[PDB]
Amino acid sequence: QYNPQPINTSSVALNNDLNTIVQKFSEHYHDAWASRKIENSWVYGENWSDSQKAHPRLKPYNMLNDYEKERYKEPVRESLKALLAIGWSVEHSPVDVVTDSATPFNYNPHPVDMTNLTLSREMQNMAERLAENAHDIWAKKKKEELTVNGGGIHPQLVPYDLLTAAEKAKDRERSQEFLKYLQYQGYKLHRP
Ligand SMILES: [Cl-]
Ligand SMILES: [Cl-]
Ligand code: NA
Ligand code: NA
């Protein structure tokens, strides 16, 4: 069938420097996410609504609660722990009027633009490995939730390689961006 088994991160703990890069990437990615939502006509609203494209998280990062910030930090932190677990080394060495009307918070996100930077084929491969691991993490938790509630199904409870590209996009894009951001910030990743 499908038995999701995320990478075993036993013993791996992030030091202050890697916690800092998780923090900085999460602020960066939030701004990237918000820039993309705003460009696609979303606006801030108190309750999330797919129908009318209103999103409570469309605020400056410093206005987010810890739950909202951890939506960025948790996957990123786990992908970094997974990299280390499998033996990788991480060496630290005008305002548009319509866009500003997206929120009442005078918020015009201007993240650093990573589309300028390229990833090696090897790092693209790694981003797919990290994206698969994020899927397996979600899938293991989802199966647990269904089981404790007496059973059930979910259409995405399938191996990563059976997902469509659109189903993979959220995790693939986060991991590609994270690896570019590591590059941008002067980190070198060394294969086992
Ligand atoms: Cl913070
Ligand atoms: Cl879910
Ligand atoms: Na172990
Ligand atoms: Na990739």
Author numbering: 2838 to 2930, 2952 to 3050
Give the text the authors published on this PDB structure:
They play a central role not only in excitation-contraction (EC) coupling of cardiac and skeletal muscles, but also in learning and memory. Insect RyRs have drawn a lot of attention since the market introduction of diamide insecticides used to control a broad range of destructive agricultural pests.
DBM Repeat34 domain (residues 2836–3050) was recombinantly expressed in E. coli and purified to homogeneity using a five-step purification protocol. DBM Repeat34 is a horseshoe-shaped domain consisting of five α-helices, two β-strands, and three 310-helices. It has a clearly intrinsic twofold symmetry as previously reported for RyR1 Repeat34, but the symmetry is partially broken by the extra helix α0′ that is only present in the second half of the domain, the difference between helices α1 and α1′, and the difference between loops α1-α2 and α1′-α2′. The two halves of DBM Repeat34 is connected by a long flexible loop previously defined as “phosphorylation loop,” where the classic phosphorylation sites are located. Second, DBM Repeat34 has an extra helix α0′ that is not observed for all three mammalian Repeat34 domains. This peculiar helix α0′ is right in the middle of the phosphorylation loop and behind the flexible portion. The surface of the domain is mainly negatively charged with a small positively charged pocket located in the inner side of the horseshoe formed by helices α1 and α2. Third, there is one glycerol molecule trapped in a positively charged pocket formed by residues from helix α1, helix α2, helix α2’, and loop α1-α2, including Trp2870, Lys2874, His2892, Arg2894, Arg2908, and Lys3028.
